């Protein structure tokens, strides 16, 4: 088993690639992430939690929209992340320029998920170390998908990957309702980020995205302080 | 079409926020239209709030019992199952309150007879927790600790429980305590309770700090309870109650049964009357 | 040994990856579809449906095509998403070229071509992916072809692959009248086949996932059993399973 | 020949516990820190009937815990045991009993019997110090 | 065609036709030239109306890339230089005369690239067919560090004098308003002359035009 | 029914949790809800946690 | 467990990327360290200074470099990977204003090297350039920024950085001075990068072995400072 | 070692995976081809279809052009792509040159395209081995057997697969001038040789008949019986 844990063009005699199940064994252990697909909206937050507050928390921003209507988070690497984010939008507005229409978000994961099976085809390449959560709002929908490293793109109506995301997901099973409602996704959001945040969240040691019928917004600081407070 | 329903809300709402016997009981019926005329859970709630007062401020057991079973006959002939159910919880809960041991036992057993199939499991819990009550109340240890023992398991897979948790550590610490073989678990599940109960709802926070005092005097530790009435926590609750059970404790600890008497006297106002 | 590289050769003659390319199919969802006198469908079981999927889909397991394409996929997502965007860039090239829908078995050579080539040369994982086309044509009517991994085909009236796809055939084959089945004997037999393979004591419609193709009005019909009419056919079996063992 | 020594040696195990001629009254503990890792066949009721799970403690487990260990120490002199208890961490007894342990060692080295919120702050943080040291870009 | 831009005392005022003609007839009366690219920069087309369009798409699309990979609100000279760069890749083969304009961290901003691929920055500039006119009006009436309101008007006549003295530019009027506070997509601005009543009815009524065969197919 | 797929031994030690369960409540009789709880209780088996890592497969 | 440390492109069990940080450990290995503060309108790299003999020419051993005419530069590690990666940096920022008509901002320099550092350690045709980058410069409406890149392409700003032999202990003496919440004027935080240095090398050192570079919002050029004003800065550090 | 390298001799002089190669035919299927006066027959072993496989598309036997039949023993995939490349490049013969393919030109096609298939790594080599049959433009019968190797050689009567051991020596037994004396004949001594290893008989084999530019007619499973019955009876009548 350890002679085809090396490639990811050889098949193990019983499963399947173990450098794909790596690169995911890496994206479990990044930074905790939760998405929340409301009835009117989407939300998704992640911790920005880092040692030595000289670190400028504004400088890099983990959640980024990807058009006026689409926004994402990850979970694990960083650098992979923002390689990905640039691939997305160079996607989207690829979609854009040819349909002069904005990009469906169905259409955009399966594409992300393209690019980045991509680097699973042949060796000497290795997989993206970070799975993606892809936030959307089209046709009076809310949209929510998880793209992954192996390609694999699905949709959930409320998941959180990352760092102790196995009690997320029970905590989330635990509290999600089909009728939630935007404000109160986002306080399920922000508490599922507190139930393993250990430290104490401030306003910036999150950061949390919202879209809606409005397009998607990642939330100012002084409206997170205030959801903090709210939720205390 | 709808500013006629409009007066009447706005009479109705002025109603509940005064909320008198006779204009509650008239607001009951007197959302006649309303209630099928709005969604369940906004009719649900107000209902249960007008209920919730009712029981509360007019505690005339006879009315108001007659209030429930008028309102259960109400959504049985309006098909409300699932408000059926909370107003036969709600039922239950008074029952209880005004000791109705066997009526409550009974008519909780056929709800949660019908309930185990439904998916509603906070509802489900709230039944089983009263249903453990009633037996402790009516001295069945071993089968009110099965009844909590399900309403636990039920409760691990509840949907957030703001107050339902605190209430079942509560209970499991009495429990625990009626089965008087161990403590420092009793002690644990009533610490629990207590600091669920922190910043929720506060009679029921001072009776489970009274009840985890107890078990620290149970214990044969004074000293703990000295400690514990200046904690960070209690001075928030601290009164005539934590003082009493310091009181106690010193009685205890000085071993004078006199002191004791004194401190018995004391309660008969205080804490007594509370089983 | 020889578990290297796919363009390798035991000193028996056999393809060691390839062989696990095929043995890696046991591990994906179990799908079917039978060809009935006057219809054929796809029936797929849903593996992964935890508690919180949108289910923002037409169908996972089931991928269609063209007008007159569709298939059941089995292997792993990435292949399935390539090999589905292959399979309609193939058929469409086909319709542009010869203005005329492709034929059900030279769609499904060009599939088994490449990935052939996949495995033929160039050091390349072979695309773990099994897949159950199925059709229309004027050629033969209604035609259904199981695909393979390695590269290979073959067309069948019955065959199901997926998590224990051997003794679902097994009794498949045991139980299958050729030429005199119509498309709700057949949805009865697919059901039948899905509740002893699948490890459920009453599978639930949700696990279930079929589309029927059926020609009529000169015009070739793709559909999905709708969670309705998905629902009365498990619950019309579930009767019928009732009283054969109130009869037995 | 070691491997399959071994394996014969789990072999011989699993005959005696459930094989052939039974045992009477011989009841078998087994702990492990890798239950996954074991044989299945040593993993079935009628040889391991009950695989009971030992986890980290929660909540009131860790109050509990703090509370039988504290017992013989010496008077905390009002230290927010409680709290200690409530902040969320992953440990295990053994790093409860640690603390506890150092606390103890702390009031030995500044020579003062009752420990308090200082010594046993120290000790906390020490127990648990599980330094990230880890390049952020895994982050 | 008539695109003309001026710089008013805090922002930008575009002013564009809708009038489109293939050879010498025209093909539409309420064409849409002012493009949108940025939600703080503005460009107006003209020459060849697809390779204008395919143009301002393409620079919209990299320059919202560029935006929100910086995060910043893009700047006019960036723009301007992406523009003039793929221009000038084509050197002259792209009939398109653009002229963009813009409010930035530095302050307005106002350029015009003709078809080739030169450009350069002007307070006031206009460009087409008509712009003999509008320029006419640039020197004759236009005054600089002049308010939002009398920017207006000034666009406004302007334009008019364009249509009056065009033939290829009028029955429509819209207004872009660039400013740090203040965007106004005025679309249309002012129509400058609407369709004249129709006297007759030509009298188009059933049974007036036979058919050879039927046939109905039912749908949904 | 609710035993897909379970061995005879892992029969027996339902049964045996059933009883226990009665046990437990100083009972002498099993009811159908203990042979329900001691089914979940004997096949409870550690599954994927990780749902990403299960959907590789189609 | 082990024996994945081979390649950059090799995903290790729990899905660590040994060679990544097998650079970040070379990034000690050029025996220096170096330091980056901020102030309001001012941010001050400082860099040790090591001379084997007099041999040398000293005027060519700057360990701080300026990548355009308004954002310097500091770095260490292997000296040809920090030669070679500010080549590149000057190659981006140049292919940048030729693009885009106007300065590269610091945070978009660093975004776009780190990507590059990141393509290199994605794919195994690449040494993934095992230098350690700070980055320095004033933007119109947020001020002057520090921003530090790393071989994995891992960029982040910072109100104070550090890097070489003596990482943590700096670190931790840069977060117990910004504990404090002092404005951090020029000369104040040009003498706490001298005292971190001094202190965390416990050698109180002459005026002739530390370069530093600073840039502030009234001098957007990014100015290295000379001997008279850095044997000013220090030696009134020293009296001061 | 030497083995897990297409291109690296042996220090005993092998390319080993092209023996290995070659070898794997030997796990296929029989398959033995006769040529006669004016006739080519293919004998191979039909796998029997369990209960749903469609026989229509288990083509063993397929013909390049219009004047030319090959059966193959081996990976069927591989059998298919080779298939398509030779009746393509039978195709593109005929537009260079406007005249039918010789069998000698598509067998060195054919052969030339294994080969170029093993002779550099990341190119795994055709593991099959095809019987080229067909008549000339003056109607010569000949017949071409394709190694895995990347060789070709003209045989008379050659059979592949598993078991060609033994129909080998069953012709060099059997074949004889008067043997292909008639199309009946050269029948006979087919379905012979075929019965030799699959004695089964009845279904499991396949036949096909290229007369002098007939555009060969599969024998269809209707004479199939017929033809056997004649064997059996011939068979009985000898004995």
């Given at each position: 088993?350890?002679?085809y844990?090396?490639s990811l063009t050889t098949f193990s005699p019983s499963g399947k690639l173990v450098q794909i199940e790596?690169?995911?064994?890496?994206?479990?252990?990044?930074?905790?992430?939760?998405?929340?697909?409301?009835?009117?909206?989407?939300?998704?937050?992640?911790?920005?939690?880092?040692?030595?507050?000289?670190?400028?928390?504004?400088?890099?921003?983990?959640?980024?929209?990807?058009?006026?209507?689409?926004?994402?988070?990850?979970?694990?690497?960083?650098?992979?992340?923002?390689?990905?984010?640039?691939?997305?939008?160079?996607?989207?507005?690829?979609?854009?320029?040819?349909?002069?229409?904005?990009?469906?978000?169905?259409?955009?994961?399966?594409?992300?998920?393209?690019?980045?099976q991509?680097?699973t085809q042949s060796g000497?390449?290795?997989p993206?170390?970070?799975?993606?959560?892809?936030?959307?709002?089209?046709?009076?929908?809310?949209?929510?998908?998880?793209?992954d490293?192996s390609g694999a793109?699905?949709?959930?109506?409320?998941?959180?990957?990352?760092?102790?995301?196995?009690?997320?997901?029970?905590?989330?099973?635990?509290?999600?309702?089909?009728?939630?409602?935007?404000?109160?996704?986002?306080?399920?959001?922000?508490?599922?980020?507190?139930?393993?945040?250990?430290?104490?969240?401030?306003?910036?040691?999150?950061?949390?995205?919202?879209?809606?019928?409005?397009?998607?917004?990642?939330?100012?600081?002084?409206?997170?302080?205030?959801?903090?407070?709210?939720?205390? | 079409?709808?500013?006629?329903?409009?007066?009447?809300?706005?009479?109705?709402?002025?109603?509940?926020?005064?909320?008198?016997?006779?204009?509650?009981?008239?607001?009951?019926?007197?959302?006649?239209?309303?209630?099928?005329?709005?969604?369940?859970?906004?009719?649900?709630?107000?209902?249960?709030?007008?209920?919730?007062?009712?029981?509360?401020?007019?505690?005339?057991?006879?009315?108001?019992?007659?209030?429930?079973?008028?309102?259960?006959?109400?959504?049985?002939?309006?098909?409300?199952?699932?408000?059926?159910?909370?107003?036969?919880?709600?039922?239950?809960?008074?029952?209880?309150?005004?000791?109705?041991?066997?009526?409550?036992?009974?008519?909780?057993?056929?709800?949660?007879?019908?309930?185990?199939?439904?998916?509603?499991?906070?509802?489900?819990?709230?039944?089983?927790?009263?249903?453990?009550?009633?037996?402790?109340?009516?001295?069945?240890?071993?089968?009110?600790?099965?009844?909590?023992?399900?309403?636990?398991?039920?409760?691990?897979?509840?949907?957030?429980?703001?107050?339902?948790?605190?209430?079942?550590?509560?209970?499991?610490?009495?429990?625990?305590?009626?089965?008087?073989?161990?403590?420092?678990?009793?002690?644990?599940?009533?610490?629990?309770?207590?600091?669920?109960?922190?910043?929720?709802?506060?009679?029921?926070?001072?009776?489970?700090?009274?009840?985890?005092?107890?078990?620290?005097?149970?214990?044969?530790?004074?000293?703990?309870?000295?400690?514990?009435?200046?904690?960070?926590?209690?001075?928030?609750?601290?009164?005539?109650?934590?003082?009493?059970?310091?009181?106690?404790?010193?009685?205890?600890?000085?071993?004078?049964?006199?002191?004791?008497?004194?401190?018995?006297?004391?309660?008969?106002?205080?804490?007594?009357?509370?089983? | 040994?020889?578990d290297?590289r796919t363009?390798?050769?035991?000193?028996?003659?056999?393809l060691y990856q390839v062989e696990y390319a095929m043995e890696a199919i046991g591990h994906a969802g179990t799908c079917?579809?039978?060809?009935?006198?006057?219809?054929?469908?796809?029936?797929?079981?849903?593996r992964?449906?935890?508690?919180?999927?949108?289910?923002?889909?037409?169908?996972?397991k089931?991928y269609?095509?063209?007008?007159?394409?569709?298939c059941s996929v089995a292997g792993i997502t990435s292949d399935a998403n390539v090999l589905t965007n292959e399979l309609?860039?193939?058929?469409?090239?086909?319709?542009?070229?010869?203005?005329?829908?492709?034929?059900?078995?030279?769609?499904?050579?060009?599939l088994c071509?490449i990935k052939q080539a996949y495995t033929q040369?160039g050091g390349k994982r072979p695309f773990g992916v099994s897949l159950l086309?199925?059709?229309?044509?004027?050629?033969?009517?209604?035609?259904?072809?199981q695909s393979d991994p390695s590269g290979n085909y073959?067309?069948?009236?019955?065959?199901?692959i997926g998590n224990?796809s051997?003794?679902?055939?097994?009794?498949?084959?045991?139980?299958?009248?050729?030429?005199?089945?119509?498309?709700?004997?057949?949805?009865?037999?697919?059901?039948?086949?899905?509740?002893?393979?699948?490890?459920?004591?009453?599978?639930?419609?949700?696990?279930?996932?079929?589309?029927?193709?059926?020609?009529?009005?000169?015009?070739?019909?793709?559909?999905?059993?709708?969670?309705?009419?998905?629902?009365?056919?498990?619950?019309?079996?579930?009767?019928?399973?009732?009283?054969?063992?109130?009869?037995? | 020949?070691?491997?399959?020594?071994?394996?014969?040696?789990?072999?011989?195990?699993?005959?005696?516990?459930?094989?052939?001629?039974?045992?009477?009254?011989?009841?078998?503990?087994?702990?492990?820190?890798?239950?996954?890792?074991?044989?299945?066949?040593?993993?079935?009721?009628?040889?391991?009937?009950?695989?009971?799970?030992?986890?980290?403690?929660?909540?009131?487990?860790?109050?509990?815990?703090?509370?039988?260990?504290?017992?013989?120490?010496?008077?905390?002199?009002?230290?927010?045991?409680?709290?200690?208890?409530?902040?969320?961490?992953?440990?295990?007894?053994?790093?409860?009993?640690?603390?506890?342990?150092?606390?103890?060692?702390?009031?030995?080295?500044?020579?003062?019997?009752?420990?308090?919120?200082?010594?046993?702050?120290?000790?906390?943080?020490?127990?648990?110090?599980?330094?990230?040291?880890?390049?952020?870009?895994?982050? | 065609?008539?695109?003309?831009?001026?710089?008013?005392?805090?922002?930008?005022?575009?002013?564009?036709?809708?009038?489109?003609?293939?050879?010498?007839?025209?093909?539409?009366?309420?064409?849409?030239?002012?493009?949108?690219?940025?939600?703080?920069?503005?460009?107006?087309?003209?020459?060849?109306?697809?390779?204008?369009?395919?143009?301002?798409?393409?620079?919209?699309?990299?320059?919202?890339?560029?935006?929100?990979?910086?995060?910043?609100?893009?700047?006019?000279?960036?723009?301007?230089?992406?523009?003039?760069?793929?221009?000038?890749?084509?050197?002259?083969?792209?009939?398109?005369?653009?002229?963009?304009?813009?409010?930035?961290?530095?302050?307005?901003?106002?350029?015009?690239?003709?078809?080739?691929?030169?450009?350069?920055?002007?307070?006031?500039?206009?460009?087409?067919?008509?712009?003999?006119?509008?320029?006419?009006?640039?020197?004759?009436?236009?005054?600089?560090?002049?308010?939002?309101?009398?920017?207006?008007?000034?666009?406004?006549?302007?334009?008019?004098?364009?249509?009056?003295?065009?033939?290829?530019?009028?029955?429509?009027?819209?207004?872009?308003?660039?400013?740090?506070?203040?965007?106004?997509?005025?679309?249309?601005?002012?129509?400058?002359?609407?369709?004249?009543?129709?006297?007759?009815?030509?009298?188009?009524?059933?049974?007036?035009?036979?058919?050879?065969?039927?046939?109905?197919?039912?749908?949904? | 029914?609710?035993?897909?797929?379970?061995?005879?031994?892992?029969?027996?030690?339902?049964?045996?949790?059933?009883?226990?369960?009665?046990?437990?409540?100083?009972?002498?009789?099993?009811?159908?809800?203990?042979?329900?709880?001691?089914?979940?209780?004997?096949?409870?088996?550690?599954?994927?946690?990780?749902?990403?890592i299960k959907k590789l497969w189609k | 467990?082990?024996?994945?440390?081979?390649?950059?492109?090799?995903?290790?069990?729990?899905?660590?990327?040994?060679?990544?940080?097998?650079?970040?450990?070379?990034?000690?290995?050029?025996?220096?360290?170096?330091?980056?503060?901020?102030?309001?309108?001012?941010?001050?790299?400082?860099?040790?200074?090591?001379?084997?003999?007099?041999?040398?020419?000293?005027?060519?051993?700057?360990?701080?470099?300026?990548?355009?005419?308004?954002?310097?530069?500091?770095?260490?590690?292997?000296?040809?990977?920090?030669?070679?990666?500010?080549?590149?940096?000057?190659?981006?920022?140049?292919?940048?204003?030729?693009?885009?008509?106007?300065?590269?901002?610091?945070?978009?320099?660093?975004?776009?090297?780190?990507?590059?550092?990141?393509?290199?350690?994605?794919?195994?045709?690449?040494?993934?350039?095992?230098?350690?980058?700070?980055?320095?410069?004033?933007?119109?409406?947020?001020?002057?920024?520090?921003?530090?890149?790393?071989?994995?392409?891992?960029?982040?700003?910072?109100?104070?950085?550090?890097?070489?032999?003596?990482?943590?202990?700096?670190?931790?003496?840069?977060?117990?001075?910004?504990?404090?919440?002092?404005?951090?004027?020029?000369?104040?935080?040009?003498?706490?990068?001298?005292?971190?240095?001094?202190?965390?090398?416990?050698?109180?050192?002459?005026?002739?072995?530390?370069?530093?570079?600073?840039?502030?919002?009234?001098?957007?050029?990014?100015?290295?400072?000379?001997?008279?004003?850095?044997?000013?800065?220090?030696?009134?550090?020293?009296?001061? | 070692?030497?083995?897990?390298?297409?291109?690296?001799?042996?220090?005993?002089?092998?390319?080993?995976?092209?023996?290995?190669?070659?070898?794997?035919?030997?796990?296929?299927?029989?398959?033995?081809?006769?040529?006669?006066?004016?006739?080519?027959?293919?004998?191979?072993?039909?796998?029997?279809?369990?209960?749903?496989?469609?026989?229509?598309?288990?083509?063993?036997?397929?013909?390049?052009?219009?004047?030319?039949?090959?059966?193959?023993?081996?990976?069927?995939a591989?059998?298919?792509?080779?298939?398509?490349?030779?009746?393509?490049?039978?195709?593109?013969?005929?537009?260079?040159?406007?005249?039918?393919?010789?069998?000698?030109?598509?067998?060195?096609?054919?052969?030339?395209?294994?080969?170029?298939?093993?002779?550099?790594?990341?190119?795994?080599?055709?593991?099959?081995?095809?019987?080229?049959?067909?008549?000339?433009?003056?109607?010569?019968?000949?017949?071409?057997?394709?190694?895995?190797?990347?060789?070709?050689?003209?045989?008379?009567?050659?059979?592949?697969?598993?078991?060609?051991?033994?129909?080998?020596?069953?012709?060099?037994?059997?074949?004889?001038?008067?043997?292909?004396?008639?199309?009946?004949?050269?029948?006979?001594?087919?379905?012979?040789?075929?019965?030799?290893?699959?004695?089964?008989?009845?279904?499991?084999?396949?036949?096909?008949?290229?007369?002098?530019?007939?555009?060969?007619?599969?024998?269809?499973?209707?004479?199939?019986?017929?033809?056997?019955?004649?064997?059996?009876?011939?068979?009985?009548?000898?004995?």
């Open positions: 088993e350890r002679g844990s090396f790596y690169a995911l064994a890496a994206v479990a252990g990044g930074a905790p992430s939760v998405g929340i697909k409301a009835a009117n909206g989407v939300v998704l937050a992640t911790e920005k939690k880092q040692k030595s507050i000289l670190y400028d928390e504004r400088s890099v921003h983990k959640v980024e929209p990807i058009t006026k209507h689409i926004g994402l988070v990850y979970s694990g690497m960083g650098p992979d992340y923002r390689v990905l984010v640039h691939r997305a939008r160079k996607l989207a507005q690829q979609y854009y320029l040819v349909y002069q229409e904005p990009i469906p978000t169905a259409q955009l994961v399966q594409r992300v998920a393209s690019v980045m991509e680097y000497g390449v290795r993206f170390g970070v799975s993606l959560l892809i936030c959307g709002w089209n046709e009076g929908r809310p949209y929510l998908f998880q793209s490293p793109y699905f949709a959930w109506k409320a998941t959180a990957m990352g760092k102790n995301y196995v009690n997320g997901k029970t905590f989330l099973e635990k509290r999600y309702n089909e009728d939630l409602e935007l404000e109160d996704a986002i306080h399920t959001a922000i508490l599922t980020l507190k139930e393993s945040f250990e430290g104490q969240m401030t306003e910036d040691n999150i950061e949390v995205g919202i879209c809606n019928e409005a397009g998607f917004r990642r939330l100012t600081p002084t409206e997170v302080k205030d959801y903090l407070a709210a939720i205390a | 079409v709808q500013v006629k329903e409009q007066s009447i809300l706005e009479l109705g709402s002025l109603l509940a926020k005064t909320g008198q016997a006779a204009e509650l009981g008239g607001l009951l019926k007197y959302v006649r239209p309303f209630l099928n005329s709005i969604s369940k859970a906004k009719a649900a709630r107000l209902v249960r709030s007008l209920l919730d007062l009712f029981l509360d401020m007019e505690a005339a057991t006879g009315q108001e019992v007659e209030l429930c079973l008028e309102c259960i006959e109400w959504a049985k002939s309006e098909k409300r199952t699932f408000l059926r159910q909370a107003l036969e919880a709600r039922l239950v809960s008074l029952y209880f309150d005004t000791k109705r041991y066997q009526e409550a036992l009974h008519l909780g057993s056929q709800l949660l007879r019908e309930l185990k199939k439904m998916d509603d499991k906070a509802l489900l819990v709230e039944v089983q927790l009263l249903e453990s009550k009633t037996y402790h109340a009516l001295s069945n240890l071993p089968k009110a600790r099965a009844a909590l023992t399900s309403a636990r398991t039920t409760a691990n897979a509840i949907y957030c429980p703001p107050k339902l948790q605190a209430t079942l550590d509560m209970q499991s610490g009495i429990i625990h305590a009626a089965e008087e073989k161990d403590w420092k678990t009793a002690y644990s599940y009533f610490y629990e309770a207590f600091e669920g109960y922190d910043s929720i709802d506060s009679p029921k926070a001072i009776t489970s700090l009274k009840y985890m005092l107890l078990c620290k005097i149970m214990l044969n530790t004074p000293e703990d309870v000295q400690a514990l009435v200046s904690g960070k926590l209690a001075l928030r609750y601290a009164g005539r109650q934590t003082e009493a059970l310091k009181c106690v404790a010193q009685a205890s600890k000085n071993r004078s049964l006199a002191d004791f008497e004194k401190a018995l006297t004391d309660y008969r106002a205080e804490l007594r009357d509370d089983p | 040994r020889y290297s363009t390798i050769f035991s000193p028996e003659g056999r079917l579809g039978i060809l009935a006198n006057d219809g054929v469908l796809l029936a797929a079981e849903r992964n449906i935890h508690k919180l999927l949108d289910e923002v889909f037409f169908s996972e089931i269609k095509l063209n007008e007159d394409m569709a309609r860039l193939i058929a469409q090239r086909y319709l542009l070229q010869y203005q005329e829908p492709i034929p059900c078995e030279q769609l499904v050579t060009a071509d040369f086309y199925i059709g229309w044509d004027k050629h033969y009517g209604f035609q259904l072809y073959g067309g069948w009236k019955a065959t199901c224990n051997a003794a679902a055939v097994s009794m498949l084959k045991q139980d299958y009248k050729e030429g005199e089945m119509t498309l709700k004997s057949a949805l009865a037999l697919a059901i039948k086949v899905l509740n002893k393979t699948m490890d459920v004591s009453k599978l639930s419609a949700e696990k279930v996932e079929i589309a029927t193709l059926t020609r009529e009005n000169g015009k070739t019909v793709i559909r999905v059993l709708k969670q309705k009419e998905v629902e009365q056919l498990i619950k019309k079996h579930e009767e019928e399973e009732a009283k054969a063992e109130r009869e037995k | 020949g070691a491997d399959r020594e071994v394996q014969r040696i789990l072999l011989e195990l699993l005959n005696q516990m459930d094989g052939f001629d039974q045992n009477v009254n011989v009841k078998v503990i087994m702990a492990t820190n890798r239950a996954d890792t074991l044989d299945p066949a040593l993993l079935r009721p009628g040889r391991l009937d009950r695989k009971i799970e030992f986890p980290l403690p929660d909540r009131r487990q860790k109050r509990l815990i703090f509370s039988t260990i504290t017992s013989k120490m010496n008077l905390s002199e009002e230290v927010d045991l409680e709290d200690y208890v409530a902040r969320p961490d992953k440990i295990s007894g053994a790093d409860i009993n640690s603390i506890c342990q150092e606390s103890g060692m702390l009031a030995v080295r500044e020579n003062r019997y009752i420990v308090l919120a200082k010594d046993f702050e120290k000790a906390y943080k020490t127990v648990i110090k599980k330094d990230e040291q880890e390049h952020e870009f895994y982050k | 065609t008539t695109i003309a831009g001026v710089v008013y005392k805090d922002g930008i005022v575009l002013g564009a036709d809708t009038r489109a003609t293939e050879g010498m007839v025209v093909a539409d009366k309420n064409c849409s030239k002012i493009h949108f690219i940025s939600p703080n920069i503005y460009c107006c087309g003209a020459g060849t109306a697809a390779d204008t369009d395919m143009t301002t798409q393409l620079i919209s699309s990299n320059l919202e890339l560029h935006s929100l990979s910086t995060g910043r609100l893009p700047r006019v000279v960036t723009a301007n230089r992406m523009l003039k760069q793929m221009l000038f890749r084509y050197q002259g083969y792209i009939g398109a005369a653009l002229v963009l304009g813009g409010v930035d961290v530095t302050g307005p901003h106002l350029y015009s690239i003709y078809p080739h691929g030169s450009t350069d920055k002007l307070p006031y500039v206009t460009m087409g067919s008509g712009s003999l006119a509008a320029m006419a009006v640039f020197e004759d009436k236009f005054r600089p560090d002049m308010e939002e309101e009398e920017a207006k008007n000034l666009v406004s006549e302007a334009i008019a004098a364009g249509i009056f003295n065009d033939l290829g530019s009028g029955s429509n009027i819209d207004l872009c308003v660039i400013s740090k506070n203040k965007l106004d997509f005025l679309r249309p601005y002012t129509v400058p002359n609407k369709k004249g009543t129709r006297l007759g009815r030509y009298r188009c009524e059933k049974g007036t035009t036979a058919v050879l065969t039927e046939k109905i197919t039912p749908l949904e | 029914e609710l035993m897909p797929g379970a061995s005879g031994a892992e029969v027996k030690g339902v049964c045996t949790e059933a009883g226990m369960y009665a046990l437990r409540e100083r009972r002498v009789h099993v009811t159908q809800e203990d042979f329900e709880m001691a089914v979940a209780k004997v096949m409870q088996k550690d599954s994927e946690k990780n749902m990403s | 467990s082990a024996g994945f440390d081979r390649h950059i492109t090799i995903f290790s069990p729990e899905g660590r990327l040994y060679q990544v940080e097998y650079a970040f450990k070379a990034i000690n290995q050029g025996g220096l360290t170096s330091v980056a503060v901020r102030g309001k309108d001012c941010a001050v790299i400082v860099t040790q200074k090591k001379v084997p003999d007099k041999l040398l020419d000293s005027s060519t051993v700057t360990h701080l470099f300026k990548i355009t005419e308004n954002i310097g530069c500091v770095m260490t590690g292997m000296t040809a990977d920090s030669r070679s990666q500010v080549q590149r940096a000057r190659y981006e920022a140049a292919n940048w204003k030729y693009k885009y008509g106007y300065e590269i901002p610091v945070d978009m320099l660093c975004k776009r090297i780190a990507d590059i550092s990141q393509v290199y350690t994605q794919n195994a045709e690449m040494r993934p350039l095992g230098c350690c980058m700070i980055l320095i410069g004033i933007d119109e409406e947020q001020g002057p920024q520090v921003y530090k890149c790393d071989p994995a392409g891992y960029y982040c700003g910072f109100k104070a950085t550090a890097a070489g032999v003596k990482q943590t202990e700096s670190t931790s003496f840069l977060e117990k001075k910004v504990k404090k919440k002092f404005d951090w004027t020029f000369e104040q935080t040009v003498e706490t990068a001298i005292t971190c240095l001094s202190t965390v090398l416990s050698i109180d050192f002459k005026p002739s072995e530390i370069e530093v570079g600073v840039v502030t919002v009234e001098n957007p050029k990014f100015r290295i400072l000379t001997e008279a004003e850095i044997d000013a800065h220090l030696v009134a550090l020293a009296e001061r | 070692s030497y083995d897990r390298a297409i291109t690296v001799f042996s220090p005993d002089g092998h390319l080993f995976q092209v023996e290995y190669a070659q070898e794997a035919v030997k796990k296929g299927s029989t398959a033995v081809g006769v040529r006669g006066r004016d006739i080519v027959v293919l004998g191979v072993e039909k796998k029997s279809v369990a209960k749903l496989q469609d026989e229509r598309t288990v083509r063993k036997i397929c013909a390049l052009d219009d004047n030319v039949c090959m059966a193959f023993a081996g990976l069927t591989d059998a298919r792509i080779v298939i398509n490349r030779a009746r393509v490049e039978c195709q593109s013969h005929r537009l260079t040159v406007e005249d039918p393919v010789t069998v000698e030109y598509i067998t060195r096609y054919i052969a030339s395209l294994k080969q170029r298939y093993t002779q550099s790594n990341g190119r795994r080599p055709f593991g099959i081995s095809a019987l080229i049959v067909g008549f000339d433009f003056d109607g010569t019968p000949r017949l071409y057997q394709t190694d895995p190797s990347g060789t070709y050689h003209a045989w008379k009567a050659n059979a592949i697969g598993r078991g060609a051991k033994s129909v080998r020596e069953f012709l060099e037994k059997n074949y004889t001038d008067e043997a292909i004396e008639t199309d009946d004949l050269t029948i006979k001594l087919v379905i012979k040789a075929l019965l030799e290893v699959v004695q089964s008989g009845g279904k499991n084999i396949e036949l096909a008949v290229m007369r002098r530019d007939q555009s060969l007619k599969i024998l269809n499973p209707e004479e199939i019986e017929k033809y056997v019955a004649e064997i059996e009876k011939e068979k009985e009548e000898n004995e």
